[PDB]
Design an enzyme around this catalytic site. Structure first.
Site, PDB file in Angstrom:
ATOM      1  N   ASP A 150     -57.203 -60.784 -66.835  1.00  0.00           N
ATOM      2  CA  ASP A 150     -56.354 -61.093 -65.317  1.00  0.00           C
ATOM      3  C   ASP A 150     -57.224 -60.144 -64.344  1.00  0.00           C
ATOM      4  OD1 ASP A 150     -54.481 -61.475 -63.924  1.00  0.00           O
ATOM      5  OD2 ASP A 150     -52.905 -61.210 -65.448  1.00  0.00           O
ATOM      6  N   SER A 163     -52.333 -63.530 -70.834  1.00  0.00           N
ATOM      7  CA  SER A 163     -52.416 -62.186 -70.774  1.00  0.00           C
ATOM      8  C   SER A 163     -51.252 -61.363 -71.645  1.00  0.00           C
ATOM      9  CB  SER A 163     -52.235 -61.385 -69.721  1.00  0.00           C
ATOM     10  OG  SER A 163     -53.359 -61.882 -68.495  1.00  0.00           O
ATOM     11  N   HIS A 187     -55.427 -60.073 -61.118  1.00  0.00           N
ATOM     12  CA  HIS A 187     -54.301 -59.822 -60.273  1.00  0.00           C
ATOM     13  C   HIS A 187     -54.037 -58.219 -60.388  1.00  0.00           C
ATOM     14  CE1 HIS A 187     -53.732 -63.916 -58.410  1.00  0.00           C
ATOM     15  NE2 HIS A 187     -53.018 -63.245 -57.595  1.00  0.00           N
TER      16      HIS A 187
END
Length: 596
Positions: A114, A167, A116
């Site tokens: 991930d 995730s 972000h």
């Protein structure tokens, strides 16, 4: 005085005068025998006031970040003298004492795959405003790195972050890895894809030590304070256990009640078109991929959707001023919204004028025909009825039973593409856009101690990526494909999705399979043409990236696949020619049966 000026500077976020005030406070050794007494005294008094105001809702997130920047600027001046004191005491006594004034050490990381980290950054800033010692491990952090950081730094709380559904399995793996090493540190779960039900059902049972789902930073601070308070350390865990057991039982009893149609019955009751009377698809102006190398960012500013940007700063206006541009008229958040909007516009103009951000994208069109639940793409010169498809996009059909009063069909993405044997040609488009240079700018702003500019530049990168996606879709509808050549609509109508056609993305409710990105990347050659890459969890890097398919059909509309049964999973595995375990891994969140 100097105490009341430090407090005022911290609370009001005044940048100018804190350096001289901190220096004169240091010089007043009569009040402060050691430079630490400055830190534990007025400095954390003002920070505690700011944190209490933020928790009570009287102070907003941008003001909190300004106060954090001022506090960081002060402690940056005070760091050399604390280091001098520690070195001197280490030389004189041979040891360094446990002289930390924070409430505890918190490790923040984004799980593997991930990219972000705006929410993680905001959580770290808010926790720092509460005198917590935050360790931020960055994005794509391996699990073993997380436990190494926790053990070396003697972390009291470990916080995991994630934005995409792949995730969740990484977070579960981290939880069971702490369980395997018998670590007792509490674990916190945060992110957009996370939920309280998933945490208690999937993440919580694997780890004996407390696992708590935190919605945002203002609740993360409460959770951390209640976990680190020895008077509330065990009672809070007892309450968490009670409520998580309750919702676990509720979920496992809801799994029995929900009804799913057999895959064949859902297919029979699926969405249908009258291809003999609906207008035929319009062939695009070209077949293949057209690459954009340096897009005009000034053409994208007018397409920016500012409501998700204000939601990032947690400036949620009240009714009726719930969104841009009416949010500025709100009496509660209007002032801060106006200030944040002005700063965003200033930095956006600076970045576009300085050419510090670059926009790249690729768009492609291919002939496509549907075979039941699959869409097969073909070459331009090849006959669809007698040619091997060059790529396939596998759709998922709704199975969850609808209300008896409802007549809605069981939708699939292949229902919007004409079937192969109908004798009618059809086409499918796909795109992928990004905004580059956000990572370097954010790193430069963070190295300068300006987390406000870093958060805003990340938000502006996402806004520009979304604006690029919107503008490119508008161009496709009218110029590159021309099935809406006479269309003329304003930005508000594009935000309302009042136009014709949809641009579903892989991993979204219309197709929650993130493995559909691999076909797009192989077909359109997205990595080589635009530099956008897929991580090992098939997330788009950089984080300011958008992709999806193009459906030009009039009747096409967004829908949620929902929950699927075992029969559709086995059919999907047979079609993709992959193991059922992989299908369950990638479609985990949407499985409607007990895999445990």
């Amino acid at each position: 005085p100097v105490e009341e000026r430090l407090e005022y500077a911290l609370v009001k976020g005044i940048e100018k005068h804190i350096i001289e005030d901190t220096e004169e406070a240091r010089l007043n050794q009569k009040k402060y025998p050691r430079p630490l007494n400055i830190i534990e005294g007025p400095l954390m008094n003002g920070m505690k006031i700011v944190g209490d105001l933020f928790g009570a809702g009287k102070m907003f997130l941008p003001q909190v970040i300004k106060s954090a920047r001022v506090m960081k600027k002060a402690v940056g001046h005070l760091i050399p003298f604390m280091e001098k004191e520690r070195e001197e005491t280490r030389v004189l006594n041979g040891t360094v004492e446990e002289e930390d004034p924070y409430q505890g050490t918190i490790v923040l990381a984004t799980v593997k795959g991930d990219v972000h980290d705006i929410g993680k950054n905001i959580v770290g800033v808010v926790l720092g405003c509460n005198n917590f010692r935050v360790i931020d491990l960055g994005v794509m952090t391996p699990c073993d790195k997380i436990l190494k950081a926790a053990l070396d730094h003697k972390a009291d709380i470990i916080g995991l972050s994630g934005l995409i559904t792949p995730s969740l399995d990484e977070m579960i793996f981290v939880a069971k890895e702490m369980e395997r090493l018998a670590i007792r540190i509490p674990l916190l779960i945060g992110g957009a894809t996370t939920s309280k039900t998933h945490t208690a059902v999937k993440i919580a049972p694997r780890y004996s030590a407390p696992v708590i789902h935190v919605l945002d930073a203002s609740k993360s601070v409460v959770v951390c304070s209640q976990l680190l308070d020895e008077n509330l350390k065990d009672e809070y865990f007892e309450e968490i256990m009670e409520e998580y057991e309750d919702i676990r039982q509720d979920h496992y009893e809801s799994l029995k009640e929900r009804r799913y149609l057999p895959l064949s019955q859902a297919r029979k009751s699926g969405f249908q078109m009258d291809w003999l009377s609906e207008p035929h698809p319009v062939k695009p102006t070209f077949i293949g991929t057209q690459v954009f190398e340096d897009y005009d960012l000034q053409k994208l500013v007018d397409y920016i959707d500012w409501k998700p940007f204000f939601d990032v700063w947690q400036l949620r206006g009240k009714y009726p001023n719930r969104g841009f541009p009416k949010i500025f008229n709100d009496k509660t958040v209007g002032g801060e919204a106006r200030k944040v909007y002005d700063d965003a516009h200033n930095m956006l103009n600076t970045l576009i004028s300085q050419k510090k951000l670059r926009a790249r994208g690729v768009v492609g069109f291919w002939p496509a025909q549907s075979i039941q639940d699959d869409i097969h793409l073909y070459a331009e010169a090849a006959v669809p009825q007698a040619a091997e498809p060059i790529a396939t996009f596998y759709g998922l059909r709704q199975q969850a039973e609808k209300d008896s009063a409802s007549t809605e069909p069981y939708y699939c993405l292949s229902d919007f593409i004409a079937p192969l044997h109908s004798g009618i040609r059809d086409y499918l488009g796909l795109f992928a856009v990004a905004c580059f240079g956000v990572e370097e700018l954010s790193k430069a702003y963070e190295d300068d101690g300006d987390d406000y500019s870093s958060i805003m530049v990340k938000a502006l990168g996402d806004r520009l990526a979304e604006a690029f996606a919107e503008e490119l879709h508008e161009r496709v509808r009218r110029e590159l494909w021309a099935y809406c050549g006479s269309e003329q609509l304003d930005v508000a109508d594009l935000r309302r999705l009042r136009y014709k056609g949809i641009r579903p993305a892989p991993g979204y409710p219309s197709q929650p399979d993130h493995t559909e990105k691999l076909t797009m990347w192989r077909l359109a050659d997205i990595e080589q043409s635009t530099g956008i890459r897929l991580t090992e969890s098939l997330a788009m890097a950089p984080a300011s990236a958008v992709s999806g398919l193009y459906f030009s059909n009039l009747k096409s509309k967004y829908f949620a696949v929902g929950k699927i049964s075992k029969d559709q999973v086995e059919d999907y595995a047979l079609r993709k020619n992959i193991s059922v375990a992989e299908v369950e891994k990638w479609l985990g969140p949407i499985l409607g049966y007990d895999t445990d």
